[PDB]
Amino acid sequence: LDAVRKRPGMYIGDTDDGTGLHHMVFEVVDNAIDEALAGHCKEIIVTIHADNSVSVQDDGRGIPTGIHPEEGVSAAEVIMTVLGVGVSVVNALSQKLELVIQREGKIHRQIYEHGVPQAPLAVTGETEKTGTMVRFWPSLETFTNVTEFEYEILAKRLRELSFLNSGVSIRLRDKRDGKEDHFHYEGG
Amino acid sequence: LDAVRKRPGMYIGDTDDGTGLHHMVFEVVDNAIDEALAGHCKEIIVTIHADNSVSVQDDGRGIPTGIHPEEGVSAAEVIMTVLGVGVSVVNALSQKLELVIQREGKIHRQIYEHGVPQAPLAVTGETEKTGTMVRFWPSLETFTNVTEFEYEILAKRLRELSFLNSGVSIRLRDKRDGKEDHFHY
Ligand SMILES: Nc1nc2ccccc2[nH]1
Ligand SMILES: Oc1ccc(Cl)cc1
Ligand SMILES: Oc1ccc(Cl)cc1
DSSP: OHHHHHOHHHHHOOSSSSHHHHHHHHHHHHHHHHHHHHSSSOEEEEEEOTTSOEEEEEOSSOOOOSBOTTTOSBHHHHHHHOOOOOHHHHHHTEEEEEEEEEETTEEEEEEEETTEESSOOEEEEEOSOOEEEEEEEEOTTTOOSOOSOOHHHHHHHHHHHHHHSTTOEEEEEETTTOOEEEEOOOOO | OHHHHHSHHHHHOOSSSSHHHHHHHHHHHHHHHHHHHTSSSOEEEEEEOTTSOEEEEEOSSOOOOSBOTTTOSBHHHHHHHOOOOOHHHHHHTEEEEEEEEEETTEEEEEEEETTEESSOOEEEEEOSOOEEEEEEEEOTTTOOSOOSOOHHHHHHHHHHHHHHSTTOEEEEEETTTOOEEEEOO
């Protein structure tokens, strides 16, 4: 990840005008849509939290959690820490990132700070559901000037995406003011 | 450097009891002694600053500044960013690190934050002197509980080093309370 940290602008885009900041959300959304398309129901939920973090949930199979034979860590960690631009870029440029994977009846949890995992991926409990959740706090050392998420920028893009991804329910929620939207095109 | 950031205790030592914190200084000192040993004047200066940073100076040749052909960056940056344990570990676990190299008639400067160079090593002026200086601010995300440098822990180790490295003068200065020592065999 040190390559991304050296020159963040080359990977995410402009880090001052807010375009790079919103590209962080859309990179994560692309991965979530990818996961949601594997299942039958297919719903993603994008939430803008009151602390200007964004979470993206899907109800898909869940990112692989088993140990990678070469890397010697969970396959989830490899995805988050090895170099669309990749979710590893989002992780690198997030001062905090929370990963929650529900898979094979188990809840898996891991926390990152500036791309560095705080502990190995851990099974913390049980679940009937499946899916992946990523919540990230954009790094204020990287992202300057425009640091807060504009609802309209996300709402517009997710609406455009709904028509290209048939059968995928996309929910947008803003916990700052309670505003929400539901984009679900069922064509074909 | 992510391997170091992932498990800092495994490289630097215990990050809670103060062992790792002080080992940061000693790793930098090891490189300063190597550089001092191959200079005419053989002195290093370890300074504890008021803002809880430490700087280590030598008056040796200055570490190499030319572009490393494989890595494509200054040889100094390769030393600071690629894996005694090494100054790259110290760089990775410092919230800020200032590098100053005096070599071949030129002053070179570079700043790192958490091991990440803020710009390429740059020529900032002219000089007659030679040597290397590294000042580092230990990351308060990594180093907990014991966050401040104890003078006597550093003085004890530098005394031991002065006997082993007989030719090398070692000065220790505390800018918080004006305390100082000069170890030389
Ligand atoms: N605050 C902060 N910024 C960082 C950048 C890279 C690795 C660790 C870091 N901690
Ligand atoms: O919902 C998701 C799924 C995958 C990833 Cl990397 C992030 C969010
Ligand atoms: O004085 C010195 C010399 C070399 C290094 Cl890497 C750091 C400090």
